[PDB]
Design a protein around this ligand. Structure first.
Ligand SMILES: [Cl-]
Ligand SMILES: [Cl-]
Ligand SMILES: [Cl-]
Ligand SMILES: [Cl-]
Ligand SMILES: [Mn+2]
Ligand SMILES: [Mn+2]
Ligand SMILES: [Zn+2]
Ligand SMILES: [Zn+2]
Lengths: 518, 519
């Protein structure tokens, strides 16, 4: 128990059903078709339906939700953005020109020797990078007034077929006359983007960038150089270096460099060769430049000192942390299959247990597949939550219910039906104890699943869905309201909890409470 | 980092493959049939095959392993038993006579009014209890010299047939006259004694039979005839209304002591709480509640109860993670999401505690509907993180789990299971190469089998774990495997062996043995 447990206005019990979405279509919908009298009552009158997929939860548009994202967003009281979504939003919304690390890098160049470099995979493959990110960067760098910009083009031959490079090269050249920036290197990813510690490969790109070791060319003719490579059966992935500009186009002493790939695994070696001691591993006859600073689109290794344009989200003052800071104790409970989700992920994506936080794990059943015991261990989770309600120790308690997602993944419709009936029973037992012991009950889900067990052709559908999830509230003194500018979403669950409890909301929660007092 | 990291003789990398068993049968064997050159080499020459099922890992005889049992036993360096196994062993090896809580209860009776009660379900059902356990308690209590012992018989009709109770009753009566000691005091159906839905009006019937003799009077000579008459009236074992023997002397009285012998908690919480706490209020009984009772349970029924238990939960002190921290040696635990709990909560002894110097790493599992769509799962990422720790050299003990063989094995797709095992072997190869570059000894084991048996005999899918042995490998050529003196080697021997290789002391709580020998 924590010192301020008494100051709380309302004690709250939060049930996160796993894989329970709202769909009015009955075909293969195990939730609609199950006997679910408890949720039928809670999901009536004052209840909301909130988004748990796509950009509402920080995922690419149209992509289904999942347990890790779902619990992260539920616990955070804000949208947790996947890296790609963050960068594409920055491009769409012209946010690079005020990006803290990009501004820092351009200030560095401006107060120094004026020289900046851009390096990465240049194609529309979208696995490691996108040319659109490089274009957005060039435009921002120009607007920020950097004197000299050079581009190092790593040719793509795996994510964009082996003969498209000549087109991305032509596109880049045409782009640059913008009227700003100069192409300095072309080399295949086989050399620049090795991830198997074959530093003799890395050395070709390192020497190309530092020393101009390669075939000399200029903007005029560079496409013909590449065509000559194609005719000799040397494709994009494997292009040996082509050198444009002269020493001025090389990565020199005091220069600043930005890698624009957002996937770390194939950038660790080249970035480390430029900005740390791995140049020693290259065995280059060239001298390593002094006083370089390297920036990455994202964090490539925690051990690296490089600043990142989009570093890992700090995720400060998630609900669990804020309650501890407010001196309010809490309880998190799940069975084994979702135990990590209510702990590691619910608490912001890190291994941390906060002062006053008590955790409880219920063993999952030992069966080959969960359709053989569709009720799983929902009953035992219910037992532990009822025990906490009778104690009354913790003003905020929460649990996860596993059956709908885990049985949903089997594709067995009748098993999913039994799973939803057992889950509804457990919810009813918790609800009756909340009403006897003075807790307000909120039921949600992290994403849907069991409401869609059949594909259109009548076969199994074993995946999560994009349907909305419920949000219920037993307290009669509140009414659900929508946000001003967007649909309600999981980021709004935690702000709302705090409102009911009568606690302050931290600035870091950019979600909003979606209830009003009445 | 930690202060004695440099004192270790050998740094150890422990890989726990999930669901990788040893079977020579090629039929449906995705492990054997997959291309696995790395594990084929590690599992040659000096290597061992160790047990991961049944009593070797604390489970009932013949029962397959699972990830919680396996990671518990691997982490603990001892057999982590299941309540049932512990009690059955105690009966076989005459250990009730020296059970600490049983002796406490018998000393209480002996120093007090001399009166002790046994209460539970009397049948061979084996779900909630076993009559063999009750007989063993009678024999031990007699040997301990308790003056008076009374038995309260809850009739079984759910875990055994509805008209079998007369046999268990006859058996019990003959048994008591074989011990010249102990008296049957009550017969009442589990419908009353063993409710688990808070129907306190049912609990009260049993409570009043035990406390005040509310029921039908009988004696040893008559009880069988009474029960048979119940049967003729369509009242079977589960629903027997109370039968009262010995009169008041057989009742639960002031200052009496009572032992419940069921090992399953869910149906004992109500009657035991009625006797030993405040739920007698809920019974609304006409009888006064007795003063100064003491209640003992076969096992712990609820943490909130003050009751001593004959077999309380394992303390699990000085598991490997705690012991390494106590020796001021740092450590690293890594897994992907599906097995992250197993390398943390379970590996460390079944609790939420992170010890000083322990660094943890969770690798996201792939977001696919079912894992046969990406059978390599995230084995490569786990390997990337282990290789980063091996290059750093910070932690003298590092360990990881590889999920694919178990999780893909559960899909029953043979070719996907094969791909899972090939990816697992590749990841192992990359780790092995890192341990040789950076001066670690490599040990590979598994928590139980799965993928070595993907097809049932009829050609259908086999999605379950198995009872096959698992490997234990060691790259250090200074040691040879040696079997234990008195049993097959098992998962409980993995942790002691690690310590032996690292040159560290072994805590007394690790009752496993190192199964290597210095050369
Ligand atoms: Cl790739
Ligand atoms: Cl933040
Ligand atoms: Cl039962
Ligand atoms: Cl112990
Ligand atoms: Mn799922
Ligand atoms: Mn398994
Ligand atoms: Zn989920
Ligand atoms: Zn396992």
């Amino acid at each position: 128990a924590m010192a301020n447990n008494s100051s709380v206005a309302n004690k709250v019990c939060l049930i996160v059903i796993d894989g329970w979405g709202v769909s009015e279509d009955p075909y293969g919908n195990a939730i609609l078709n199950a006997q679910t009298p408890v949720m039928d009552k809670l999901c009536s009158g004052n209840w909301a339906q909130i988004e748990a997929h796509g950009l509402h939860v920080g995922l690419p548009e149209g992509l289904m939700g999942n347990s890790e994202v779902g619990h992260l967003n539920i616990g955070a009281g804000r949208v947790i953005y996947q890296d790609i979504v963050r960068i594409n939003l920055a491009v769409k919304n012209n946010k690079f020109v005020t990006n803290e690390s990009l501004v820092d890098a351009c200030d560095r160049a401006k107060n120094g020797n004026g020289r900046l470099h851009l390096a990465g995979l240049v194609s529309d493959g979208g696995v490691h990078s996108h040319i659109d990110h490089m274009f957005a960067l060039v435009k921002a760098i120009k607007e920020l007034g950097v004197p000299e910009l050079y581009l190092h083009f790593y040719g793509d031959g795996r994510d964009t077929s082996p003969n498209s490079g000549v087109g991305f090269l032509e596109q880049t050249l045409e782009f640059l006359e913008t009227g700003y920036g100069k192409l300095a290197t072309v080399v295949g990813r086989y050399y620049a983007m090795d991830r198997d510690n074959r530093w003799e490969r890395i050395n070709v790109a390192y020497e190309a960038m530092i020393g101009g070791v390669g075939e000399t060319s200029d903007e005029a003719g560079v496409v013909e150089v590449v065509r000559k490579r194609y005719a000799a059966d040397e494709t994009d992935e494997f292009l040996k270096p082509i050198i444009l500009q002269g020493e001025k186009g090389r990565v020199q002493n005091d220069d600043t460099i930005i890698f624009f790939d957002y996937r770390a695994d194939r950038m660790r070696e080249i970035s480390a060769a430029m900005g740390m001691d791995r140049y020693k591993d290259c065995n280059s006859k060239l001298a390593h430049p002094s006083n370089l600073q390297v920036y990455g689109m994202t964090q490539y290794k925690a051990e690296f000192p490089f600043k990142s344009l989009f570093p890992p989200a700090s995720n400060k003052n998630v609900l669990a942390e804020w309650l501890a800071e407010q001196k309010v104790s809490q309880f998190h409970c799940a069975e084994t299959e979702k135990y990590a989700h209510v702990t590691f992920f619910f608490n912001g994506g890190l291994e941390k247990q906060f002062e006053g936080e008590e955790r409880c794990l219920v063993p999952s059943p030992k069966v080959a597949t969960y359709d053989l015991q569709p009720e799983m261990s929902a009953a035992g989770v219910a037992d532990k939550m009822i025990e906490q309600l009778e104690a009354g120790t913790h003003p905020f308690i929460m649990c996860n219910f596993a059956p709908p997602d885990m049985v949903g993944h089997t594709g067995v419709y009748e098993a999913a039906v039994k799973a939803c009936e057992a889950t509804d029973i457990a919810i009813g037992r918790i609800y009756e104890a909340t009403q006897k012991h003075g807790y307000s009950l909120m039921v949600t889900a992290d994403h849907g699943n069991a409401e869609k067990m059949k594909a259109p052709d009548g076969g199994k559908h074993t995946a999560h869905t994009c349907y909305r999830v419920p949000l219920t509230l037993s307290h009669p003194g509140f009414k659900f309201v929508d946000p001003a500018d967007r649909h309600p979403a999981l980021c709004d669950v935690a702000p709302t909890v705090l409102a009911i409890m009568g606690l302050p909301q931290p600035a870091e929660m950019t979600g909003v409470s979606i209830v009003q007092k009445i």
